[PDB]
Enzyme design. Structure first.
Site, mmCIF file in Angstrom:
data_model
loop_
_atom_site.group_PDB
_atom_site.id
_atom_site.type_symbol
_atom_site.label_atom_id
_atom_site.label_comp_id
_atom_site.label_asym_id
_atom_site.label_seq_id
_atom_site.Cartn_x
_atom_site.Cartn_y
_atom_site.Cartn_z
ATOM 1 N N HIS A 82 -37.604 -36.827 -28.561
ATOM 2 C CA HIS A 82 -36.486 -35.873 -28.642
ATOM 3 C C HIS A 82 -35.212 -36.720 -28.563
ATOM 4 O O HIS A 82 -35.114 -37.659 -27.744
ATOM 5 C CB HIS A 82 -36.608 -34.867 -27.497
ATOM 6 C CG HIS A 82 -35.564 -33.776 -27.500
ATOM 7 N ND1 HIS A 82 -35.165 -33.136 -28.668
ATOM 8 C CD2 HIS A 82 -34.823 -33.234 -26.498
ATOM 9 C CE1 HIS A 82 -34.227 -32.259 -28.366
ATOM 10 N NE2 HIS A 82 -34.027 -32.286 -27.065
ATOM 11 N N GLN A 126 -30.207 -25.932 -31.506
ATOM 12 C CA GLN A 126 -30.911 -26.196 -32.767
ATOM 13 C C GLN A 126 -31.802 -24.994 -33.081
ATOM 14 O O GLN A 126 -32.140 -24.733 -34.256
ATOM 15 C CB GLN A 126 -31.695 -27.468 -32.607
ATOM 16 C CG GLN A 126 -32.597 -27.456 -31.450
ATOM 17 C CD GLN A 126 -33.163 -28.826 -31.049
ATOM 18 O OE1 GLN A 126 -32.688 -29.393 -30.006
ATOM 19 N NE2 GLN A 126 -34.116 -29.305 -31.731
ATOM 20 N N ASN A 176 -27.467 -32.052 -24.485
ATOM 21 C CA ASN A 176 -28.722 -31.539 -25.059
ATOM 22 C C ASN A 176 -28.461 -30.568 -26.212
ATOM 23 O O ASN A 176 -27.456 -29.824 -26.211
ATOM 24 C CB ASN A 176 -29.546 -30.829 -23.958
ATOM 25 C CG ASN A 176 -30.977 -30.623 -24.392
ATOM 26 O OD1 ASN A 176 -31.440 -31.506 -25.361
ATOM 27 N ND2 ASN A 176 -31.704 -29.721 -24.000
ATOM 28 N N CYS A 206 -33.236 -32.060 -33.488
ATOM 29 C CA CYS A 206 -32.628 -32.869 -32.373
ATOM 30 C C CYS A 206 -31.712 -34.027 -32.952
ATOM 31 O O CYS A 206 -30.631 -34.332 -32.341
ATOM 32 C CB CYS A 206 -33.643 -33.288 -31.369
ATOM 33 S SG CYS A 206 -35.205 -33.617 -32.328
HETATM 34 C C1 LIG Z 1 -36.458 -32.824 -31.177
HETATM 35 C C2 LIG Z 1 -37.001 -31.622 -31.871
HETATM 36 O O1 LIG Z 1 -36.420 -31.107 -32.690
HETATM 37 C C3 LIG Z 1 -38.318 -31.206 -31.250
HETATM 38 C C4 LIG Z 1 -39.490 -30.895 -32.132
HETATM 39 C C5 LIG Z 1 -40.177 -32.226 -32.881
HETATM 40 C C6 LIG Z 1 -41.360 -31.750 -33.378
HETATM 41 C C7 LIG Z 1 -42.069 -33.041 -34.053
HETATM 42 N N1 LIG Z 1 -43.300 -32.729 -34.236
HETATM 43 N N2 LIG Z 1 -38.239 -30.034 -30.401
HETATM 44 S S1 LIG Z 1 -37.300 -29.869 -29.410
HETATM 45 O O2 LIG Z 1 -37.612 -30.872 -28.273
HETATM 46 O O3 LIG Z 1 -35.846 -29.864 -29.810
HETATM 47 C C8 LIG Z 1 -37.635 -28.153 -28.784
HETATM 48 C C9 LIG Z 1 -37.143 -27.069 -29.566
HETATM 49 C C10 LIG Z 1 -37.384 -25.758 -29.065
HETATM 50 C C11 LIG Z 1 -37.992 -25.609 -27.835
HETATM 51 C C12 LIG Z 1 -38.306 -24.082 -27.304
HETATM 52 C C13 LIG Z 1 -38.469 -26.670 -27.094
HETATM 53 C C14 LIG Z 1 -38.213 -27.975 -27.526
#
Ligand SMILES: *CC(=O)[C@H](CCCCN)NS(=O)(=O)c1ccc(C)cc1
Length: 212
Positions: free
Chosen positions: A159, A19, A175, A25
Site C-alpha cells: 500500500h 480512493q 492516507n 493508493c
Molecule cells: C493500495 C490499494 O489500492 C490496495 C489494493 C491493492 C490490491 C492489489 N491486489 N487497497 S487499499 O489498501 O487502498 C484498501 C482499499 C479499500 C479498503 C476497504 C481497504 C484497503
C-alpha cells in the site's frame, strides 16, 4: 533540518481524500508528491487528478495495483491535470489527458530515495514531501483511529501513502482512505527504533519528481 517538519501548516497539502473501492493508493500518493513540489517554488497550491493517472497509466493496473513511481515519471514526461478538469470517480477508464486539452502541471524529473535509511527519508521529506509504501494489509493499521503505530505489523509492503512531516520520534503519513481513519485521515508511525526496513516496511521504496 528542523526538529519538526509539518507541510500542512506550510500550505503544501490540501484536504484529505479517499480512493474508495478502488485499489489506486499509487496515483493518489503521487498527486500529493508532485503537488507539494509544485507549491514549494511557484507558491501555488493545487489539487491534481489521480483519476487521470489511473486511466492513462497502463503500466500500472489502475483500480487495483500500480507504481507511485510510474505516475510521477508519467507527469514529468507528459503532465497532469487539475482534480476539477479530471476529478476522481474511482473506476479506471480511457485516457482523457489529450481529450481534456492542455496540461496544467508538468514536472521536470523523478528521483528515488535510497531505500532503508530513515536519515535519508527525512531529508527529502524536509526538502519536499515524498511517496512511500508500507504494510497496510495490516489488521491493526486498518483499525488505527489515532495514535503512534508501532505494530504489530510486517515487512510485506503493499500500500502506498504519503509522508507530510516527522518529529524527533513520530513520522507523519497521509492516507488515501477517508478522514474516518487514523487521526482525521492522518496517522503517526514511530521512527528511531533500529528497524531498518522501518515498521510496516515504510522504508522499502520512496519517491519524487523534480522541479526547476
Ligand atoms: C493500495 C490499494 O489500492 C490496495 C489494493 C491493492 C490490491 C492489489 N491486489 N487497497 S487499499 O489498501 O487502498 C484498501 C482499499 C479499500 C479498503 C476497504 C481497504 C484497503
Amino acid at each position: 533540518i528542523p526538529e519538526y517538519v509539518d507541510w500542512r501548516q506550510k500550505g503544501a497539502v490540501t484536504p484529505v481524500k479517499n480512493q474508495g473501492s478502488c485499489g489506486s493508493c499509487w496515483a493518489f500518493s503521487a498527486v500529493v508528491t508532485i503537488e507539494g513540489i509544485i507549491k514549494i517554488r511557484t507558491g501555488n497550491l493545487n489539487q491534481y487528478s489521480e483519476q487521470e493517472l489511473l486511466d492513462c497509466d497502463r503500466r500500472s493496473y489502475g483500480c487495483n495495483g500500480g507504481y507511485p513511481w510510474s505516475a510521477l515519471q508519467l507527469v514529468a514526461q507528459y503532465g497532469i491535470h487539475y482534480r476539477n478538469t479530471y476529478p476522481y470517480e474511482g473506476v479506471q477508464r480511457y485516457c482523457r489527458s489529450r481529450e481534456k486539452g492542455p496540461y496544467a502541471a508538468k514536472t521536470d524529473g523523478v528521483r528515488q530515495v535510497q531505500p532503508y535509511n530513515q536519515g535519508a527519508l527525512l531529508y527529502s521529506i524536509a526538502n519536499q514531501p515524498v511517496s512511500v509504501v508500507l504494510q497496510a494489509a495490516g489488521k491493526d493499521f486498518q483499525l488505527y483511529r489515532g495514535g503512534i503505530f508501532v505494530g504489530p505489523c510486517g515487512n510485506k509492503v503493499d500500500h502506498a501513502v504519503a509522508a507530510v512531516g516527522y518529529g524527533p520520534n513520530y513520522i507523519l503519513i497521509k492516507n488515501s482512505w477517508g478522514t474516518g481513519w487514523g487521526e482525521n485521515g492522518y496517522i503517526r508511525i514511530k521512527r528511531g527504533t533500529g528497524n531498518s526496513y522501518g515498521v510496516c516496511g515504510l522504508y522499502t521504496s520512496s519517491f519524487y519528481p523534480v522541479k526547476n
